[PDB]
Design a protein around this motif. Structure first.
Motif, mmCIF file in Angstrom:
data_model
loop_
_atom_site.group_PDB
_atom_site.id
_atom_site.type_symbol
_atom_site.label_atom_id
_atom_site.label_comp_id
_atom_site.label_asym_id
_atom_site.label_seq_id
_atom_site.Cartn_x
_atom_site.Cartn_y
_atom_site.Cartn_z
ATOM 1 N N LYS B 122 0.834 -1.199 0.000
ATOM 2 C CA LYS B 122 0.000 0.000 0.000
ATOM 3 C C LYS B 122 0.868 1.248 0.000
ATOM 4 O O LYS B 122 0.712 2.127 -0.855
ATOM 5 C CB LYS B 122 -0.941 0.005 1.196
ATOM 6 C CG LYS B 122 -1.956 -1.113 1.146
ATOM 7 N N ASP B 123 1.791 1.316 0.954
ATOM 8 C CA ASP B 123 2.785 2.380 0.983
ATOM 9 C C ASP B 123 3.434 2.512 -0.397
ATOM 10 O O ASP B 123 3.434 3.591 -0.999
ATOM 11 C CB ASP B 123 3.839 2.074 2.050
ATOM 12 C CG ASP B 123 4.905 3.136 2.148
ATOM 13 N N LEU B 124 3.969 1.400 -0.895
ATOM 14 C CA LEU B 124 4.488 1.338 -2.252
ATOM 15 C C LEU B 124 3.535 1.995 -3.252
ATOM 16 O O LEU B 124 3.932 2.827 -4.068
ATOM 17 C CB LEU B 124 4.686 -0.117 -2.657
ATOM 18 C CG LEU B 124 4.951 -0.247 -4.155
ATOM 19 C CD1 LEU B 124 6.455 -0.137 -4.420
ATOM 20 C CD2 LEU B 124 4.286 -1.489 -4.742
ATOM 21 N N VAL B 125 2.271 1.605 -3.194
ATOM 22 C CA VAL B 125 1.308 2.103 -4.156
ATOM 23 C C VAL B 125 0.863 3.511 -3.786
ATOM 24 O O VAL B 125 0.628 4.341 -4.665
ATOM 25 C CB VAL B 125 0.131 1.135 -4.298
ATOM 26 C CG1 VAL B 125 0.643 -0.183 -4.866
ATOM 27 N N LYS B 126 0.771 3.802 -2.492
ATOM 28 C CA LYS B 126 0.564 5.182 -2.069
ATOM 29 C C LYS B 126 1.608 6.084 -2.729
ATOM 30 O O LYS B 126 1.277 7.147 -3.256
ATOM 31 C CB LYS B 126 0.621 5.307 -0.549
ATOM 32 C CG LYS B 126 -0.598 4.733 0.143
ATOM 33 N N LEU B 127 2.863 5.643 -2.710
ATOM 34 C CA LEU B 127 3.904 6.259 -3.522
ATOM 35 C C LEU B 127 3.442 6.318 -4.974
ATOM 36 O O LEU B 127 3.266 7.404 -5.536
ATOM 37 C CB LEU B 127 5.204 5.460 -3.425
ATOM 38 C CG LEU B 127 5.805 5.317 -2.024
ATOM 39 C CD1 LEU B 127 6.876 4.237 -2.017
ATOM 40 C CD2 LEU B 127 6.359 6.647 -1.535
ATOM 41 N N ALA B 128 3.217 5.141 -5.558
ATOM 42 C CA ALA B 128 2.740 5.036 -6.941
ATOM 43 C C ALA B 128 1.571 5.994 -7.187
ATOM 44 O O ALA B 128 1.543 6.724 -8.182
ATOM 45 C CB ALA B 128 2.326 3.604 -7.256
ATOM 46 N N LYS B 129 0.612 5.987 -6.272
ATOM 47 C CA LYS B 129 -0.452 6.970 -6.289
ATOM 48 C C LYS B 129 0.145 8.373 -6.251
ATOM 49 O O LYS B 129 0.016 9.141 -7.210
ATOM 50 C CB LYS B 129 -1.386 6.750 -5.110
ATOM 51 C CG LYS B 129 -2.140 5.440 -5.179
ATOM 52 C CD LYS B 129 -2.884 5.187 -3.886
ATOM 53 C CE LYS B 129 -3.434 3.775 -3.817
ATOM 54 N NZ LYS B 129 -3.970 3.493 -2.460
ATOM 55 N N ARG B 130 0.834 8.688 -5.161
ATOM 56 C CA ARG B 130 1.427 10.004 -4.980
ATOM 57 C C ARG B 130 2.190 10.455 -6.223
ATOM 58 O O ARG B 130 2.045 11.595 -6.667
ATOM 59 C CB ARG B 130 2.347 10.008 -3.765
ATOM 60 C CG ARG B 130 2.854 11.391 -3.422
ATOM 61 N N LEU B 131 2.990 9.555 -6.787
ATOM 62 C CA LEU B 131 3.653 9.823 -8.052
ATOM 63 C C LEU B 131 2.630 10.212 -9.103
ATOM 64 O O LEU B 131 2.604 11.354 -9.563
ATOM 65 C CB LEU B 131 4.373 8.590 -8.530
ATOM 66 C CG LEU B 131 5.486 8.133 -7.622
ATOM 67 C CD1 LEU B 131 5.810 6.730 -8.054
ATOM 68 C CD2 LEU B 131 6.695 9.045 -7.738
#
Lengths: 283, 193, 257, 190
Positions: B122-131
């Motif tokens: 999620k954090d990873l994808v939160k990054l991916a999201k944030r990106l």
């Protein structure tokens, strides 16, 4: 090396402010940051100039951050070319109080300076004076609080006076000033006492950890409390007040003599005046 | 070609500490960077990149620029055996790109995986999201154990990505030499940039 | 009718750099915006390095300039170069011909660019001397001939001022502080003593001048020191100094307990 | 036109605004000629071409109402049409001047309105007159909304003059209101 009193010029104030409203940085969830040039050599620190530093905080509750080192070492020497005497000292954030990454990044500035200082400009001014507050970091490694001042160099004397002119105090003398400075101090006191009071509450409520180091100091505040309308003091003050009366009984008195003499002179001018006027009324 | 800001994410880490092909992985990283960045500054002059270290002490190892000053900056070492700050490093690299200079430069990131890659999806994808939110270009350099893949890195490039190079493109580096030859394939370079 | 508005930070940076350069006519550049044909606003300033020679055209450093420009871009201080400051320490506010040529080199950049002359030394604490104007005591140089004067004002904020107020404020622990008593006593014993010798002086001046006029008076008092302004002035210290000390104690005793 | 003829080079020695002013100084001379004045302005009026300088051309506009104040509403509104048709610069100022001139004391929102744009059009030249005529239109107890607007535009609109003349308009449409404007007064005071 070890320094005690910190001096600040008003140009870092106005500069930092213009950084604040220049960059539209909200005072709620965001702060402004820049660096400080001046003289760190002696056992005081004379701050003179400053310039704004672009930087980012990590979303909410910043774990990391970014400050541009290239911006620094690109600007610095571009200041050196102007006044070489202003050395890079430390940085500032306009955010009300300190924060988390503060103690982390000061360690960073130890790269570009020697001692490194951090002061906080209050951009809101909604509180009382001294919008600045000066800090260093000593071992552990926390921020020691330092005294500050606003010390106008000649140029800033000229500047602030031309401007603040339309706002300055018009009562000079000496008595009004002193008796004011006092009450200003009384207001100050009452504030600090609040602070300690409701804190200790938070101690008893706000999940007070312990801080046996504070409580010790409170006790030491009480132990230093001058009691005692004691037969000793009651005499000291008494013997002192009388000395003051003798000095006053002279000043006020003789001064009255001076007015009297002046009055006499005035009556002299009037008397002589009506003589010559009434004289002229003849023809 | 490129007008966008980039970040170079280097792990000097359990992989970089350790030669994955001449001379070290961490060294194999190096000239590949310049190679890349050259083509990056050849993509366009003004194409900017960051350089940052995560591990137990994430930080920028040089930032903003557009020429050699990075190649300058990258010249010196790092903690060689270090560990993942990736998320943080990336999250830094994100904020980095939030200050990217003279915008109209899109956000880009280039990331060496020299670490076992510890993070949560999620954090990873939160990054991916944030990106994707921030709209960052994200390409990754990964030669992991196995590799680092069937993992965050795989989800991530996907998870960042509505549009490829406006968000993310992946390459997971294979064992052996020919990095510049290898990545010549991957949309770490060329293709959509 | 035409005017410029000079923000506070500009003016203080100005006077600082000027007062620091004495006496080699420094120079720098002015960042701002042209509102209409009747206005120029200067919100910012940066300082231009020195050189083996005084201010002049090449004194302007392009490398330095743009190098500063972009640097400020990153900080969002984007604004035209609207004018250039300068200083003529001791010689008042006017443009030398050499000032003029350079001013032209700023005409062809923008037709509304202005010249600002600051005069560090004379600039008194009261009304700071500043002057801004553009081409076509000072009349010797053709104030109205080759060039012409402009007007100036200052963009303000209720806070800015509020910071500046504390400029001549005090400290915190202040107000409750009681100067060394024993030492104070000397002022009253020593101060009163010095006055005593004067007391007779005032007596002799009243018994003497008692029979004279003001023209004769100037001969007496331009020479020596009449004891009048000494007793009245001297009483000032004793009065307020004693009252503050007396008052300070009165509070510490009751308050601090 | 006695001296007007005397120096024609006068006009040479006049300047765009003086040229503008010299043209307006005509309405004075003819003030009380409720027919001729327009014909007086005719040669210098609008559309009727001009020898030079749109200010002189602008001059009639304001110059016109000088005679026709209160009585030129038609031409005014007519000129206001010319205004409305294009509010800006002299062509809008001199007109923007003479409009409220005749429109003074008469409440016409258009006068307020049409100017309010010409106002908001932010020509230190033009927008100024709006700050007057709008006051002139609603000169009276006026309306607090324009006041808000003006007062807003005051703080809002960025100009010395355009900002300035607003309070004057504020001064206008607060007329005999006395106790009323005290707020804005206090506001203006504050």
């Amino acid at each position: 090396l070890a320094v005690q009193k910190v001096v600040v010029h008003p140009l870092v104030l106005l500069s930092v402010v213009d950084h604040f409203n220049r960059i539209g940085k909200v005072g709620n969830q965001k702060r402004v940051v820049g660096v400080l040039l001046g003289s760190w050599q002696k056992k005081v620190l004379d701050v003179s100039n400053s310039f704004a530093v672009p930087f980012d905080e990590d979303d909410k509750d910043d774990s990391v951050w970014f400050l541009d080192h290239d911006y620094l070492e690109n600007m610095y020497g571009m200041f050196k070319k102007v006044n070489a005497r202003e050395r890079i000292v430390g940085w500032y954030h306009t955010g009300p109080k300190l924060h988390k990454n503060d103690i982390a990044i000061n360690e960073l500035m130890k790269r570009y300076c020697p001692n490194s200082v951090l002061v906080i400009i209050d951009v809101k001014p909604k509180d009382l004076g001294l919008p600045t507050e000066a800090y260093i970091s000593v071992e552990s490694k926390t921020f020691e609080h330092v005294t500050s001042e606003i010390g106008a160099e000649e140029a800033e004397e000229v500047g602030v006076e031309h401007l603040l002119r339309d706002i300055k105090d018009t009562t000079v003398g000496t008595l009004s000033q002193r008796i004011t400075n006092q009450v200003h101090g009384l207001k100050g006191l009452n504030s600090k006492l609040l602070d300690i009071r409701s804190y200790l509450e938070k101690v008893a409520t706000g999940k007070l950890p312990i801080n046996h180091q504070i409580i010790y100091q409170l006790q030491d505040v009480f132990n230093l409390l001058p009691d005692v309308s004691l037969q000793e003091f009651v005499k000291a003050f008494y013997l002192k007040t009388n000395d003051q009366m003798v000095v006053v009984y002279l000043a006020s008195l003789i001064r009255s003599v001076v007015a009297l003499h002046n009055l006499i002179n005035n009556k002299i001018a009037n008397r002589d005046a009506e003589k010559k006027e009434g004289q002229e009324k003849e023809e | 070609m490129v007008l966008e800001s980039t970040m170079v994410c280097v792990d000097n880490s359990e992989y970089m500490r350790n030669g994955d092909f001449l001379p070290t992985r961490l060294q194999a990283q190096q000239d590949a960077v310049n190679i890349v960045c050259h083509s990056k500054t050849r993509s366009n002059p003004e194409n900017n990149v960051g350089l940052i270290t995560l591990a137990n002490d994430c930080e920028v190892l040089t930032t903003l620029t557009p020429d050699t000053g990075r190649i300058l900056s990258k010249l010196h070492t790092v903690q060689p055996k270090g560990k993942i700050t990736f998320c943080t490093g990336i999250r830094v690299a994100h904020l980095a790109l939030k200050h990217r200079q003279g915008k109209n430069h899109k956000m880009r990131i280039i990331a060496f995986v020299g670490s076992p890659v510890e993070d949560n999806e999620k954090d990873l994808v939160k990054l991916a999201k944030r990106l994707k939110k921030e709209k960052v270009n994200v390409d990754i350099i990964n030669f992991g154990e196995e590799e680092v893949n069937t993992e965050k890195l795989t989800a991530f490039v996907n998870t960042l990505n509505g549009k490829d190079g406006t968000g993310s493109h992946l390459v997971t580096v294979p064992p052996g030499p020919s990095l510049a030859d290898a990545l010549i394939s991957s949309p770490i370079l060329a293709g959509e940039g | 009718a035409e005017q410029v508005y000079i923000s506070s930070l500009a003016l203080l940076k100005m006077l600082k750099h000027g007062r620091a350069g004495v006496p080699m006519e420094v120079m720098g550049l002015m960042l701002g915006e042209f509102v209409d044909d009747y206005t120029v606003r200067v919100i910012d300033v940066f300082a231009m390095p020195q050189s083996g020679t005084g201010v002049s055209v090449e004194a302007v450093d392009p490398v330095f300039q743009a190098k500063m420009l972009d640097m400020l871009k990153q900080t969002g201080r984007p604004e035209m170069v609207v004018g250039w400051y300068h200083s003529h320490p001791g010689f008042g506010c006017w443009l030398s011909g050499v000032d003029i040529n350079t001013q032209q080199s700023f005409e062809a950049l923008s037709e509304r660019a202005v010249a600002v002359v600051v005069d560090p030394i004379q600039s008194v604490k009261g009304k700071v001397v500043i002057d801004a104007f553009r081409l076509i005591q000072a009349l010797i140089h053709g104030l109205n001939r080759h060039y012409y004067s402009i007007t100036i004002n200052y963009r303000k904020n209720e806070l800015e001022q509020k910071m500046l107020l504390n400029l001549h404020k005090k400290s915190w622990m202040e107000g409750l502080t009681l100067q060394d008593y024993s030492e104070h006593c000397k002022h009253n014993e020593s101060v009163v003593k010095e006055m005593l010798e004067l007391a007779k002086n005032y007596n002799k001046a009243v018994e003497e001048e008692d029979k004279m006029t003001p023209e004769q008076l100037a001969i007496k008092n331009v020479g020596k020191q009449d004891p009048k302004r000494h007793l009245e002035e001297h009483v000032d210290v004793l009065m307020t100094s004693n009252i503050v000390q007396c008052l300070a104690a009165m509070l510490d005793t009751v308050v601090f307990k | 036109d006695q001296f007007l003829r005397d120096n024609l080079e006068w006009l040479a020695r006049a300047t765009n605004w003086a040229k503008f002013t010299a043209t307006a100084s005509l309405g004075v001379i003819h003030k009380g000629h409720e027919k001729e004045a327009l014909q007086l302005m005719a040669t210098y009026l609008p559309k009727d071409t001009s020898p030079g300088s749109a200010y002189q051309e602008g001059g009639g506009l304001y110059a016109l109402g000088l005679i026709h104040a209160n009585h030129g509403g038609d031409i005014i509104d007519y000129l206001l049409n010319q205004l409305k048709n294009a509010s800006n610069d002299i062509v809008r100022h001199g007109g923007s001047l003479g409009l409220g001139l005749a429109a003074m004391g008469t409440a016409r929102q258009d006068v307020y309105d049409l100017l309010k744009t010409n106002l908001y059009q932010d020509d230190a030249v033009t927008g100024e007159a709006a700050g007057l005529a709008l006051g002139l239109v609603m000169l009276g107890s006026k309306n607090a909304q324009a006041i808000e607007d003006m007062v807003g535009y005051a703080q809002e609109t960025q100009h010395e003059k355009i900002l300035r003349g607003l309070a004057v308009g504020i001064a206008l449409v607060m007329y005999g209101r006395m106790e009323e404007a005290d707020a804005l007064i206090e506001s203006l005071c504050r």
